[PDB]
């Protein structure tokens, strides 16, 4: 509790297409606090559910990369909204996808923000959000 | 008309299973009023979010087909759990996918149930759930 707790979410069983980007995000988040996340660099379901729920409640900020569709990321964002968490979502329009209306439409520009970004930009945008 | 039955399934995550969603929605109509975005373009997404949240809050039972990964379906299920809704999830293992741990691990066998099924079983299973 001596540093901010930053909870990172991104697709796993939805697909690990963006795993490298997730590691880039996590690595940068470590500059701004303790990172709580299921994601581990390449280098039971009830327990997985309960641990991520535990991390989520501990979180001061929830950071989600929402480009790859994922039930778990969506579920974690829904639980996070119900917990009144500050939320930042990061989405890549160049993927060719249209972001879920439930995520884009949940944005209010303050406590729930959805930022579009392109390859090469995410570290700069994280610096902006966390006030480097 | 009650019960109100809220159906969720992938849309912008992919419409791979849209025909199965229609089969599910058609069978749900036998047991209650069906509230769903599904019917057989961003820029106004706030209105979509608010409308599905409205339907979810009115729902007596939430039915989700969770085979195709979807942020919206997952988000709706997360909000549904926070609302302490009765939830039924339906998953097809023959899809070759491993269902999200956040959905499978949310199950408690009563208020939150996850049923595996195969093509051709979904109507019988819905009949069974809704008595
Ligand atoms: C909670 C942590 C992680 O971000 C998310 C992964 O969900 P999947 O359904 O496995 O993609 O769950
Ligand atoms: C709310 C209703 C529907 O089941 C779900 C679809 O989400 P997508 O992110 O568009 O797949 O959203």
GROMACS .gro file of N, CA and C in nm, chain B residues 12-84:
model
  219
  144UNK      N    1  -1.977  -0.757  -3.182
  144UNK     CA    2  -1.853  -0.701  -3.236
  144UNK      C    3  -1.732  -0.789  -3.207
  145UNK      N    4  -1.744  -0.885  -3.114
  145UNK     CA    5  -1.642  -0.987  -3.102
  145UNK      C    6  -1.642  -1.084  -3.218
  146UNK      N    7  -1.748  -1.085  -3.298
  146UNK     CA    8  -1.764  -1.179  -3.407
  146UNK      C    9  -1.904  -1.235  -3.406
  147UNK      N   10  -1.966  -1.248  -3.523
  147UNK     CA   11  -2.100  -1.302  -3.535
  147UNK      C   12  -2.099  -1.447  -3.581
  148UNK      N   13  -1.992  -1.520  -3.549
  148UNK     CA   14  -1.977  -1.657  -3.596
  148UNK      C   15  -2.098  -1.742  -3.560
  149UNK      N   16  -2.154  -1.721  -3.441
  149UNK     CA   17  -2.260  -1.806  -3.387
  149UNK      C   18  -2.398  -1.742  -3.394
  150UNK      N   19  -2.418  -1.645  -3.484
  150UNK     CA   20  -2.542  -1.569  -3.482
  150UNK      C   21  -2.664  -1.657  -3.507
  151UNK      N   22  -2.650  -1.761  -3.589
  151UNK     CA   23  -2.762  -1.851  -3.614
  151UNK      C   24  -2.798  -1.929  -3.488
  152UNK      N   25  -2.698  -1.969  -3.410
  152UNK     CA   26  -2.725  -2.036  -3.283
  152UNK      C   27  -2.788  -1.941  -3.183
  153UNK      N   28  -2.750  -1.813  -3.185
  153UNK     CA   29  -2.813  -1.715  -3.097
  153UNK      C   30  -2.962  -1.702  -3.129
  154UNK      N   31  -2.997  -1.701  -3.258
  154UNK     CA   32  -3.138  -1.691  -3.296
  154UNK      C   33  -3.215  -1.815  -3.250
  155UNK      N   34  -3.154  -1.933  -3.263
  155UNK     CA   35  -3.217  -2.054  -3.212
  155UNK      C   36  -3.242  -2.044  -3.063
  156UNK      N   37  -3.144  -1.992  -2.989
  156UNK     CA   38  -3.159  -1.976  -2.844
  156UNK      C   39  -3.269  -1.876  -2.813
  157UNK      N   40  -3.263  -1.758  -2.876
  157UNK     CA   41  -3.363  -1.655  -2.851
  157UNK      C   42  -3.502  -1.707  -2.885
  158UNK      N   43  -3.515  -1.781  -2.994
  158UNK     CA   44  -3.646  -1.835  -3.031
  158UNK      C   45  -3.701  -1.926  -2.922
  159UNK      N   46  -3.615  -2.011  -2.865
  159UNK     CA   47  -3.661  -2.101  -2.760
  159UNK      C   48  -3.689  -2.026  -2.630
  160UNK      N   49  -3.612  -1.922  -2.600
  160UNK     CA   50  -3.636  -1.845  -2.479
  160UNK      C   51  -3.773  -1.779  -2.482
  161UNK      N   52  -3.820  -1.739  -2.600
  161UNK     CA   53  -3.952  -1.676  -2.610
  161UNK      C   54  -4.063  -1.766  -2.558
  162UNK      N   55  -4.040  -1.898  -2.552
  162UNK     CA   56  -4.141  -1.987  -2.497
  162UNK      C   57  -4.157  -1.970  -2.347
  163UNK      N   58  -4.057  -1.914  -2.279
  163UNK     CA   59  -4.054  -1.910  -2.134
  163UNK      C   60  -4.060  -1.770  -2.076
  164UNK      N   61  -4.051  -1.666  -2.158
  164UNK     CA   62  -4.060  -1.532  -2.106
  164UNK      C   63  -4.041  -1.429  -2.215
  165UNK      N   64  -4.041  -1.303  -2.172
  165UNK     CA   65  -4.010  -1.191  -2.260
  165UNK      C   66  -3.858  -1.184  -2.276
  166UNK      N   67  -3.811  -1.174  -2.400
  166UNK     CA   68  -3.669  -1.176  -2.428
  166UNK      C   69  -3.622  -1.033  -2.454
  167UNK      N   70  -3.526  -0.989  -2.373
  167UNK     CA   71  -3.460  -0.860  -2.390
  167UNK      C   72  -3.320  -0.886  -2.444
  168UNK      N   73  -3.292  -0.836  -2.564
  168UNK     CA   74  -3.163  -0.865  -2.625
  168UNK      C   75  -3.134  -0.766  -2.736
  169UNK      N   76  -3.006  -0.734  -2.750
  169UNK     CA   77  -2.959  -0.656  -2.863
  169UNK      C   78  -2.962  -0.735  -2.993
  170UNK      N   79  -2.972  -0.867  -2.985
  170UNK     CA   80  -2.958  -0.951  -3.103
  170UNK      C   81  -3.084  -0.947  -3.188
  171UNK      N   82  -3.063  -0.941  -3.319
  171UNK     CA   83  -3.171  -0.934  -3.416
  171UNK      C   84  -3.125  -1.005  -3.542
  172UNK      N   85  -3.211  -1.089  -3.599
  172UNK     CA   86  -3.176  -1.163  -3.720
  172UNK      C   87  -3.182  -1.072  -3.842
  173UNK      N   88  -2.080  -0.015  -3.623
  173UNK     CA   89  -2.127   0.122  -3.638
  173UNK      C   90  -2.111   0.199  -3.507
  174UNK      N   91  -1.987   0.236  -3.475
  174UNK     CA   92  -1.960   0.312  -3.354
  174UNK      C   93  -2.001   0.458  -3.373
  175UNK      N   94  -1.986   0.537  -3.267
  175UNK     CA   95  -2.020   0.679  -3.268
  175UNK      C   96  -2.133   0.714  -3.173
  176UNK      N   97  -2.223   0.620  -3.149
  176UNK     CA   98  -2.329   0.639  -3.051
  176UNK      C   99  -2.331   0.526  -2.950
  177UNK      N  100  -2.212   0.477  -2.914
  177UNK     CA  101  -2.204   0.355  -2.835
  177UNK      C  102  -2.257   0.373  -2.693
  178UNK      N  103  -2.253   0.496  -2.641
  178UNK     CA  104  -2.308   0.521  -2.508
  178UNK      C  105  -2.453   0.475  -2.499
  179UNK      N  106  -2.531   0.500  -2.604
  179UNK     CA  107  -2.672   0.462  -2.603
  179UNK      C  108  -2.688   0.310  -2.601
  180UNK      N  109  -2.600   0.238  -2.670
  180UNK     CA  110  -2.603   0.092  -2.668
  180UNK      C  111  -2.570   0.041  -2.529
  181UNK      N  112  -2.464   0.094  -2.469
  181UNK     CA  113  -2.427   0.053  -2.334
  181UNK      C  114  -2.542   0.074  -2.237
  182UNK      N  115  -2.603   0.193  -2.239
  182UNK     CA  116  -2.710   0.222  -2.144
  182UNK      C  117  -2.830   0.131  -2.166
  183UNK      N  118  -2.861   0.098  -2.292
  183UNK     CA  119  -2.978   0.017  -2.320
  183UNK      C  120  -2.960  -0.127  -2.271
  184UNK      N  121  -2.843  -0.186  -2.297
  184UNK     CA  122  -2.817  -0.321  -2.248
  184UNK      C  123  -2.809  -0.325  -2.096
  185UNK      N  124  -2.753  -0.220  -2.034
  185UNK     CA  125  -2.755  -0.215  -1.888
  185UNK      C  126  -2.897  -0.207  -1.835
  186UNK      N  127  -2.984  -0.133  -1.905
  186UNK     CA  128  -3.124  -0.124  -1.865
  186UNK      C  129  -3.191  -0.261  -1.871
  187UNK      N  130  -3.170  -0.332  -1.982
  187UNK     CA  131  -3.229  -0.465  -1.997
  187UNK      C  132  -3.175  -0.560  -1.891
  188UNK      N  133  -3.044  -0.556  -1.867
  188UNK     CA  134  -2.985  -0.642  -1.765
  188UNK      C  135  -3.049  -0.620  -1.630
  189UNK      N  136  -3.070  -0.493  -1.592
  189UNK     CA  137  -3.125  -0.465  -1.459
  189UNK      C  138  -3.268  -0.515  -1.446
  190UNK      N  139  -3.345  -0.515  -1.555
  190UNK     CA  140  -3.481  -0.567  -1.554
  190UNK      C  141  -3.487  -0.719  -1.562
  191UNK      N  142  -3.375  -0.785  -1.588
  191UNK     CA  143  -3.377  -0.927  -1.620
  191UNK      C  144  -3.406  -1.011  -1.496
  192UNK      N  145  -3.487  -1.115  -1.514
  192UNK     CA  146  -3.504  -1.217  -1.412
  192UNK      C  147  -3.402  -1.328  -1.426
  193UNK      N  148  -3.362  -1.359  -1.549
  193UNK     CA  149  -3.256  -1.456  -1.576
  193UNK      C  150  -3.171  -1.402  -1.691
  194UNK      N  151  -3.040  -1.418  -1.678
  194UNK     CA  152  -2.944  -1.380  -1.781
  194UNK      C  153  -2.896  -1.508  -1.847
  195UNK      N  154  -2.911  -1.517  -1.979
  195UNK     CA  155  -2.865  -1.632  -2.056
  195UNK      C  156  -2.757  -1.583  -2.152
  196UNK      N  157  -2.639  -1.642  -2.142
  196UNK     CA  158  -2.525  -1.602  -2.223
  196UNK      C  159  -2.470  -1.723  -2.297
  197UNK      N  160  -2.452  -1.709  -2.429
  197UNK     CA  161  -2.378  -1.807  -2.508
  197UNK      C  162  -2.234  -1.757  -2.515
  198UNK      N  163  -2.143  -1.829  -2.450
  198UNK     CA  164  -2.010  -1.777  -2.421
  198UNK      C  165  -1.901  -1.850  -2.500
  199UNK      N  166  -1.936  -1.913  -2.612
  199UNK     CA  167  -1.836  -1.986  -2.690
  199UNK      C  168  -1.743  -1.890  -2.764
  200UNK      N  169  -1.798  -1.787  -2.827
  200UNK     CA  170  -1.718  -1.689  -2.899
  200UNK      C  171  -1.670  -1.581  -2.802
  201UNK      N  172  -1.539  -1.561  -2.786
  201UNK     CA  173  -1.493  -1.458  -2.692
  201UNK      C  174  -1.545  -1.319  -2.729
  202UNK      N  175  -1.589  -1.245  -2.627
  202UNK     CA  176  -1.653  -1.116  -2.648
  202UNK      C  177  -1.637  -1.030  -2.525
  203UNK      N  178  -1.587  -0.908  -2.544
  203UNK     CA  179  -1.577  -0.813  -2.433
  203UNK      C  180  -1.715  -0.775  -2.380
  204UNK      N  181  -1.810  -0.749  -2.470
  204UNK     CA  182  -1.943  -0.709  -2.427
  204UNK      C  183  -2.013  -0.817  -2.347
  205UNK      N  184  -2.005  -0.942  -2.394
  205UNK     CA  185  -2.066  -1.052  -2.320
  205UNK      C  186  -2.002  -1.065  -2.183
  206UNK      N  187  -1.869  -1.061  -2.178
  206UNK     CA  188  -1.801  -1.067  -2.049
  206UNK      C  189  -1.838  -0.951  -1.959
  207UNK      N  190  -1.841  -0.829  -2.014
  207UNK     CA  191  -1.879  -0.712  -1.936
  207UNK      C  192  -2.020  -0.728  -1.881
  208UNK      N  193  -2.114  -0.771  -1.966
  208UNK     CA  194  -2.252  -0.790  -1.922
  208UNK      C  195  -2.261  -0.894  -1.811
  209UNK      N  196  -2.183  -1.002  -1.822
  209UNK     CA  197  -2.184  -1.103  -1.717
  209UNK      C  198  -2.124  -1.048  -1.588
  210UNK      N  199  -2.022  -0.963  -1.599
  210UNK     CA  200  -1.964  -0.903  -1.479
  210UNK      C  201  -2.062  -0.811  -1.409
  211UNK      N  202  -2.128  -0.723  -1.485
  211UNK     CA  203  -2.231  -0.639  -1.427
  211UNK      C  204  -2.345  -0.724  -1.371
  212UNK      N  205  -2.378  -0.834  -1.440
  212UNK     CA  206  -2.484  -0.922  -1.393
  212UNK      C  207  -2.450  -0.983  -1.258
  213UNK      N  208  -2.325  -1.026  -1.240
  213UNK     CA  209  -2.285  -1.083  -1.112
  213UNK      C  210  -2.294  -0.979  -1.001
  214UNK      N  211  -2.249  -0.856  -1.029
  214UNK     CA  212  -2.259  -0.751  -0.929
  214UNK      C  213  -2.404  -0.722  -0.893
  215UNK      N  214  -2.496  -0.738  -0.989
  215UNK     CA  215  -2.639  -0.726  -0.963
  215UNK      C  216  -2.697  -0.850  -0.895
  216UNK      N  217  -2.617  -0.954  -0.874
  216UNK     CA  218  -2.664  -1.079  -0.814
  216UNK      C  219  -2.777  -1.141  -0.896
   0.00000   0.00000   0.00000
